[PDB]
Every structure is written in structure tokens, then in C-alpha cells.
Amino acid sequence: AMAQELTAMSAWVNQDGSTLYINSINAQGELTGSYINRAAGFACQNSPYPVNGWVFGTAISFSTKWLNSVESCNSITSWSGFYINTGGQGKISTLWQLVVNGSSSPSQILKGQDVFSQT
Amino acid sequence: AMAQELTAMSAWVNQDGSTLYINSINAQGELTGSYINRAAGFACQNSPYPVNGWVFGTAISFSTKWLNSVESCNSITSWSGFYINTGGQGKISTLWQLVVNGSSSPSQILKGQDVFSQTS
Ligand SMILES: O=C(O)CCCC[C@@H]1SC[C@@H]2NC(=O)N[C@@H]21
Ligand SMILES: O=C(O)CCCC[C@@H]1SC[C@@H]2NC(=O)N[C@@H]21
């Protein structure tokens, strides 16, 4: 059998239970999808947010604007990462940055690390 | 002379001479544009690369995929940052991350700071 690959129509869950749904990848490599945050310490949980970004081989970037019809967090997250297949599972290993509307210093940009696994 | 703000059809130049062209921002804040890199120590200079991203008030993210018909650098840069009005002059202060096709460790993701200023 086969580990999940980095393709259109693929779903990925990180260590905190948040899910990335990659829905389309166009011929240029532009991606669209949605994201559901389930990580404690952050608001905008349990509802879908829009995603765009890029794929280039095993490299990927994706970014979510935290506004939908139910809750706004006045912020944007961007992830930079790469696909690997280890331990029988496809994964996307990422570093992310979160910027809040109204910031005045780069010290206010929050940073973290997420590893997303297939399924 | 009031500041250029985060609007469609705005151009911005960083401390290395690279230019961000924001071409469109739709009513949801989704952005498209193009980017010309002029930073010493990096390839893929002096040709336009495609950009997408998001605007949210003064917060902005944008990302460039380093492939066009002239040169490929097998990589993607993502910027996160915020707009500031310094008194008639607009700037975007950012932190960036660059990830390369075929990477196997987060230590291989490059990081830096860029500040862009409004330009004609
Ligand atoms: O609180 C906010 O400003 C919006 C929610 C942010 C959730 C962040 S995005 C990076 C990290 N990965 C997640 O799945 N959740 C957090
Ligand atoms: O070398 C590459 O992989 C492609 C070009 C990368 C240029 C980077 S993007 C971040 C920083 N800011 C710039 O204007 N140039 C560099």
C-alpha cells in the first residue's frame, strides 16, 4: 500500500488536531483549500477558514486569513514546509508565522512549528 | 502627500532593491501580484515571479513561487508582516521564510527580515 502524497484533494491533521484540506492545485501550482483550527491557546476554533498558497515539488506554502461568517481573529497565518514520507505515513513538516492586524513591531509576529500527517 | 496604503495596484521596494507589485486585492482581501528579486546572494534576480496572499486591515501575507519561463530556483518564499504609516509614507515590515523543494529538515528553511517602502 501507499502513503498519501502531496496532491490536490488531500487532507492533513497536525499534532494539535487541526486539519488542512487541500482542494485544488492549478497548473501553476497555486493551491486552494480550507483549514479548521483545533489548537488550544488560539481562538477561531472548529469552523472553516480559507486557504491559498503554492506547491513546488515537495515544497509547500499555505496561508489562512482568520475571517469567516462566524468568527474573526483579525490575523493571518502562513506556513512554509515540505512533504516527507516516513514511518508509513505522508506528512508535511512546517514552520509558521502569525501576524495580527494593527501590529507595530516584528516582535509581535508569533512563530511555531506544526507537523501534519495524512488522514 | 498622504501615504500609499495596502491597495490594489501598489508597488513597494525593499532594502535590497526588490519590488513587490500588488496587482489585485478582492473584497475578501485575497491578493495577487508579482515580485522582482534584486538581493545579492540569491538567484532568480531581475525577472517577475507570481505572488498570492491575504490582506486583513494592516496585516498582510504574501508568497512567491520561484518558477517562471526565465529561471527556476526550486523554492517558495512566504512573507508575514504589517503596514505602517510613518507620516505620509507607507511601509510594510515583514519576516520571511524560504523553503526548498526536496528539504528534509526545518533547519533548512531560511529566514530573514524585509522592510518595503512605497514607490512610484
Ligand atoms: O488565534 C488566531 O489569531 C487565529 C487562530 C490561529 C491558529 C494557529 S495558526 C498556527 C497554529 N496551527 C494551528 O493549527 N493553530 C495555530
Ligand atoms: O534564491 C532563491 O531561492 C529564489 C530567490 C529568493 C529571494 C529572497 S526572498 C526573501 C529575500 N527578500 C528578497 O527580496 N530576496 C530574498
- Topology (CATH) of A1-119: Lipocalin (2.40.128)
Q: Helix, strand or coil for residue A107? A: helix
Asked if the Cβ–Cβ distance from A103 to B56 is below 8 Å, we say no
Query: Has A16 been labeled as part of a binding site?
Result: no
Q: Cell digits for B58?
A: 494592516
- For residue A14, the tally of other CB atoms under 10 A from its CB is 21
Instruction: Tell whether A13 is within 8 A of chain B (Cβ).
Output: no
Q: For cell 513587490, what's the residue? A: B20
Asked if the Cβ–Cβ distance from B60 to A50 is below 8 Å, we say no
Q: What DSSP state is assigned to residue B45? A: B
Experimental method: X-ray
Yes or no: is domain B1-120 CATH 2.40.128.30?
A: yes
- Residues B114/B9, Cβ–Cβ less than 8 Å: no
- For residue A7, the tally of other CB atoms under 10 A from its CB is 11
Ligand 2 centroid distance, CA of B40 (Å): 9
Asked if the Cβ–Cβ distance from A75 to B59 is below 8 Å, we say yes
Query: Has A75 been labeled as part of a binding site?
Result: yes
